[PDB]
């Protein structure tokens, strides 16, 4: 049962969330990279706040933010507000969204192509 709780969070291979130069020299990238970056920034700041003996309010805030980072990575939008990129109302596209729906992996690329 405890496996429903994550200690190590897996990271998808980079080609499945590419960082590609489009024709003309600019860069296009998947949303998973910004979700993972949120996660890693908050996790690293948590490790530093622990190593530096911070009060309880602060560690509690960090841990809450870390749980929500993981939640946005896996099922963004499910609980609370959906994480968006700066200057846009569009929700970022998490792993659940990649799997499901009309445009999801199954219906879009596995049951028809």
């Amino acid at each position: 049962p405890e496996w429903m709780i994550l200690e190590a969070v897996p990271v998808l291979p980079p080609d499945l969330r590419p960082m590609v130069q489009v024709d003309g020299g600019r860069f296009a990238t998947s949303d998973l990279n910004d979700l993972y970056r949120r996660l890693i920034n908050r996790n690293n700041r948590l490790k530093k706040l622990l190593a530096q003996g911070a009060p309880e309010i602060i560690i509690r805030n960090e841990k809450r933010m870390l749980q929500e980072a993981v939640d946005a990575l896996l099922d963004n939008g499910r609980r609370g507000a959906p994480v968006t990129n700066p200057g846009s109302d569009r929700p970022l596209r998490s792993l659940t969204d990649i799997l499901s729906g009309k445009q999801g992996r199954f219906r879009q690329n596995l049951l028809g192509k």
Partner: protein
């Protein structure tokens, strides 16, 4: 030719300016011609007044704004991919309250896009159109509660994103609730906060069925306004510390702040009219002398209780009534986005005001114009209502400018739109056309402004009527809203008049849309014209009254799709609207004053006016539209011509002497033809290609950039490796194809070289090099070639280089080259034709002329339409048109037949009689009798009851000709068609759906990044989608191997697709496939969710589909 016209209805007023909705909306929102002091508190001026002043202590106040002149004219913006815009300056002053210092400056806020003369925009070089939006008008509404019958919901709706919806409801427990931000609380509390006491509420609401007792709560009156206010703040903000100033700020911003809450001026007026009260501002309450004073809440509660009890003069509201739905035109939508940009700018202003060296703070040091610039740029580039302009033909642009959408920002989500919104409401009469809407998902959500309709200052659609006093029809016209219209008995526009007096004893009229037979004494108004019920497009359909609405819709819509033809003609049967459409769409050119024409040219017309001045009109010649159709103006006057004001100088695209010319007048035979016109297909004569009927000019734009790379620069060059002179024949010195060349698929248009990616040559490459002793060049061929199935004649090249005057490209690119390729498209098998009645079909066969059915005098028909398309579709109008066309063929005249007021059968029969004389008496004079085959057809017709027995051959042929039918000879045999056939002239258009643009095929090509499946779309050399349902089709056949091919060898089995291609080029059978790569992506994306997915064998032992490449 002669233009005979029918019709007995004189139209008092002409059609209004057809683009006035767009142009006037934007003019009102900008006020650019108004001197600043004289501006009204509307538009962007009202946005400025809302945002300013900015406080907290420093203050930044707004004096005025001004719009400068556009840096570049419209054509230059279209070329340079620039936006046609004006600089926006705002005069601001900073004041320190304590210091009294006042620093004043005019700061620059960026640019605002200007609207062109025809009501369109130019954003980044492409013409765009902002589509008006329809929505529920702000105000106070009363709707029935769908659960509890005898109960009603009071709804208080402000402007979109200008406050919260507020619902009042009488609960099952008797207390009156108030829902706001999804929070139900007893209204009594807010009534107390307003300063109301139980005495006043008791004397105001006691009359109603004891309902006022559900408003009576003792614990509420037990506290003063402050304690009730804090109670409400706690009920609305769980957890927020209930401070006093915090609660006052929240409640004020929620209910009385004109900068946060805003009914429209229309919402204001409608609340005033509904509740029978008067409003001071556009808010529900006010903050006066420290306390809150009510404006709207008590009137609304009074009306609600009165409707619940049932006292008369209270009715639930129809929310689809066009007196409760209003239009948000260009100006209002742009003003809203402007207001949002201004709010962000103000946030930044206060941010900079708090910090910073407060001794030296100018207006320039506080305003970051970027948020405002971004909001406007977003609205004009990526809004749902900012649409790529449809300029296929001029009517396309006109219709686009006059379209109304219920979708978009602040509107409805699709699939959240039931029958009600999409219905044609009774109040649509005269305001929104009932036929011009899309077929498919958007039906009833995209509509068109009726032809006589105007939108008033409040945003409601108004239609004109004539005053009728004592049975006399004045020429005083009154534009009404639907609310106003519902008060009157309005007669029909066709009611017979002698002079100005109603000459009929019984008169067909409307009362609240209901049709009623009424006496002339009861008639108060009368319709202006039948034209006022329909859109512009629908008003172009002759004999509309004989066409089922479902097909009128199609003909209406398809006129928008007509392609400008090099020999375009106006129809031989018109509705009388074909000239206004050319004029208002700014297609053609006209004379500005009376004058004599000095010069005439393929490129320019110079006119000497009565003032003695010389005015030169240049002509737009072979310009490329958004849809690639050619837009050239051709001169129609000659040197020395006398011209009065408003006389035609130049014909625009799809204009014939100032008449809207969307197609050709062809000679039609309505008969089957050996299956080649089966199921709406059409058969045409090669004589149409011979005389360049249905031929159109099309221009495509190709573009290429050379940019700086981390591996060296790209460069446009003629020096392209590994190419012969055969490949470089038509390339100029610099590498760009020469104007005039004929380019076919595969031809280079612009040479370009790119430095190769870092690569160690594979040992095979090294040995091949050694064998051939040739160094691999540093660069590679990346030239821009002609895509498959395209080409034509080069007509323009633009070249822009970094370091050249006036030129600055985006960071990185050294040079940009554009090539414009023209092509003359003849009609071909696959192209789409249609007439104005909804008859549409694809050319399926082009016969040589000697196979075409011909009249006895040797004249072959042009196209053969199949009669099986008529009865099921009930578009008999195209039949009557054909009949009239027949007469016009031999009389040599065209006709104007107003809709519902046009040519009837007897007058068409008179014309046909005259035509038959021209058609047959010619024969009798020239010395030929009736033909034997004509006798045989006459026998057949006599058995069909079409002619009377015992009349002469000529008399019977005249009888048939009066029925519109003639003898027709098969071109292949010379024997007659056993029956007489309906032959006549019909107006037929070539639509934008040409097969040249659609045919596509692919063996192998680009694949997608993650899925490794083929890209989609002709432009990407894409593969067809074999979707879920195609898979079901293959499954139901039991084509396991065909299906497995689709799923592996042809899509994303990498090894499989490679091995299949190799086997086929070698001549072997294709190998058995392997795992599709997207399933591996699924396995890894599940692993990314902490789910272990394991392919096993029958022994439950894992199988590695990754071939070890990801197991340590």
């Amino acid at each position: 030719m002669e233009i005979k016209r029918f019709g007995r209805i004189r139209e008092v007023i002409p059609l209004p300016p057809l683009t006035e909705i767009q142009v006037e909306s934007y003019r009102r929102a900008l006020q650019a011609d108004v001197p600043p002091e004289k501006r009204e508190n509307v538009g962007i001026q009202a946005a400025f007044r809302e945002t300013f002043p900015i406080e907290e202590g420093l203050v930044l106040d707004f004096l005025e704004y001004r719009l400068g002149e556009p840096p570049f004219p419209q054509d230059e913006c279209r070329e340079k991919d620039l936006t046609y815009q004006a600089p926006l300056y705002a005069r601001l002053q900073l004041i320190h309250k304590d210091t009294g210092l006042i620093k004043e400056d005019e700061v620059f806020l960026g640019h605002i896009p200007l609207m062109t003369e025809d009501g369109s925009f130019i954003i980044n070089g492409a013409d765009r159109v902002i589509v008006s939006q329809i929505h529920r008008s702000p105000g106070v509404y009363f709707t029935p509660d769908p659960a509890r019958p005898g109960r009603y919901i009071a709804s208080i709706i402000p402007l979109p994103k200008r406050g919260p919806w507020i619902d009042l409801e009488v609960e099952p427990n008797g207390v009156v609730s108030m829902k706001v931000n999804k929070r139900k609380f007893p209204l009594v509390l807010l009534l107390r906060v307003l300063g109301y006491d139980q005495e006043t509420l008791a004397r105001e609401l006691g009359a109603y069925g004891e309902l006022v007792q559900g408003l009576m709560d003792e614990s509420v009156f037990a506290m003063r306004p402050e304690e009730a206010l804090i109670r409400l703040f706690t009920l609305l903000r769980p957890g927020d510390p209930p401070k006093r100033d915090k609660a006052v700020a929240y409640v004020y911003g929620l209910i009385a702040d004109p900068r946060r809450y805003d009914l429209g001026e229309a919402g204001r007026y409608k609340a005033e009219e509904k509740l029978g009260i008067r409003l001071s501002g556009r808010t529900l309450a006010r903050f006066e002398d420290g306390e809150f004073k009510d404006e709207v809440f008590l009137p609304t509660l009074r009306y609600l209780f009165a409707l619940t009890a049932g006292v008369p003069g209270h009715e639930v509201d129809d929310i689809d009534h066009l007196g409760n739905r209003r239009i948000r035109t260009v100006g209002e939508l742009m003003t809203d986005q402007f207001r949002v940009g201004l709010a962000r700018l103000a946030r930044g202003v206060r941010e900079r005001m708090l910090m910073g060296s407060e001794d030296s703070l100018t207006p320039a040091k506080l305003v970051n114009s970027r948020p405002l610039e971004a909001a406007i740029r977003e609205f004009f580039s990526r809004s749902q209502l900012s649409q790529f302009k449809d300029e296929t033909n001029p009517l396309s642009s006109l219709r686009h400018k006059r379209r109304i959408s219920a979708l978009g920002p602040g509107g409805l989500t699709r699939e959240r739109a039931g029958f009600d919104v999409r219905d044609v409401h009774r109040t649509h009469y005269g305001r929104i056309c009932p036929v011009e809407t899309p077929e498919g998902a958007n039906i009833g959500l995209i509509t068109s402004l009726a032809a006589y309709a105007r939108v008033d200052e409040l945003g409601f659609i108004r239609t004109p009527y004539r005053r009728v006093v004592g049975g006399v029809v004045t020429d005083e016209v009154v534009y009404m809203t639907a609310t106003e219209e519902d008060r009157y008995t309005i007669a029909q526009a066709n009611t017979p008049l002698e002079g100005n007096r109603i000459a009929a004893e019984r008169v067909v009229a409307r009362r609240k849309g209901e049709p009623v037979i009424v006496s002339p004494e009861e008639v108060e108004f009368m319709d202006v014209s039948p034209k006022q019920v329909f859109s512009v497009n629908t008003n172009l359909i002759p004999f509309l009254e004989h066409d089922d609405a479902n097909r009128a819709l199609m003909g209406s819509n398809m006129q928008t799709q007509a392609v400008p033809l090099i020999r375009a003609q106006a129809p031989v049967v018109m509705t009388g609207l074909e000239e206004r459409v050319v004029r208002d769409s700014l297609a053609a050119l006209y004379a500005e004053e009376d004058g004599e024409v000095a010069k005439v040219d393929g490129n320019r017309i110079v006119v000497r006016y009565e003032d003695g001045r010389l005015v030169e009109y240049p002509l737009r010649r072979f310009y490329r539209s958004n849809q690639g159709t050619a837009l050239d103006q051709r001169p129609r006057v000659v040197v020395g011509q006398r011209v009065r004001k408003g006389d035609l100088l130049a014909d625009g695209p799809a204009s014939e002497n100032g008449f809207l010319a969307l197609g050709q007048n062809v000679l039609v035979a309505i008969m089957p033809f050996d299956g080649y016109n089966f199921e709406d297909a059409i058969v045409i004569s090669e004589e149409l290609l011979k005389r360049d009927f249905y031929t159109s000019i099309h221009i495509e734009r190709y573009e290429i950039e050379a940019r700086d790379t981390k591996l060296g620069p790209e460069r446009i060059t003629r020096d392209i490796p590994h190419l012969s002179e055969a490949a470089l024949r038509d390339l100029d010195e610099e590498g760009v194809v020469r104007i005039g060349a004929e380019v076919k698929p595969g031809d280079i248009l612009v040479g370009r070289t790119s430095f190769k990616g870092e690569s160690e040559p594979t040992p095979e490459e090294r040995l091949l090099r050694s064998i051939f002793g040739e160094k691999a060049r540093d660069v590679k061929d990346t030239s821009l070639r002609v895509p498959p199935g395209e080409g034509g004649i080069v007509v323009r090249t633009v070249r822009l280089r970094r370091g050249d005057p006036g030129v600055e490209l985006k960071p990185g690119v050294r040079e940009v080259v554009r090539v414009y390729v023209a092509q003359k498209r003849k009609l071909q098998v696959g192209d789409k034709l249609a007439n104005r009645h909804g008859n549409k079909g694809v050319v399926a066969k082009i016969l040589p002329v000697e196979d075409m059915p011909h009249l006895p005098d040797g004249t072959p028909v042009d196209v053969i339409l199949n009669p099986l398309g008529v009865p099921s579709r009930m578009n008999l109008g195209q039949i009557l048109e054909t009949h009239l066309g027949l007469a016009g063929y031999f009389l040599g005249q065209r006709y104007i037949s107003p809709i519902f007021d046009g040519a009837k059968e007897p007058e068409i029969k008179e014309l046909l009689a005259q035509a038959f004389e021209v058609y047959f008496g010619k024969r009798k004079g020239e010395g030929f009798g009736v033909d034997k085959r004509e006798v045989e057809v006459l026998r057949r017709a006599e058995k069909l009851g079409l002619v009377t027995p015992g009349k002469t051959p000529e008399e019977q042929l005249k009888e048939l000709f009066l029925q519109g039918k003639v003898v027709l000879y098969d071109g292949r045999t010379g024997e007659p068609i056993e029956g007489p056939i309906v032959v006549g002239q019909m107006f037929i258009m070539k639509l934008y759906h040409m097969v040249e643009d659609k045919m596509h095929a692919r063996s192998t090509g680009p694949y997608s990044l993650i899925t490794q499946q083929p890209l989609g779309g002709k432009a990407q050399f894409g593969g067809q989608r074999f979707g879920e349902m195609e898979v079901w089709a293959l499954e139901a056949y039991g084509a396991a191997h065909t299906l497995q091919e689709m799923l592996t060898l042809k899509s994303d089995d990498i090894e499989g697709r490679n091995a299949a291609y190799e086997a086929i080029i070698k001549g072997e059978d294709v190998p058995e496939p392997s795992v599709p790569e997207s399933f591996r992506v699924l396995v890894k994306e599940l692993q990314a969710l902490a789910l272990d997915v394991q392919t096993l064998d029958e022994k439950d032992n894992p199988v590695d589909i990754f071939e070890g490449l990801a197991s340590k």
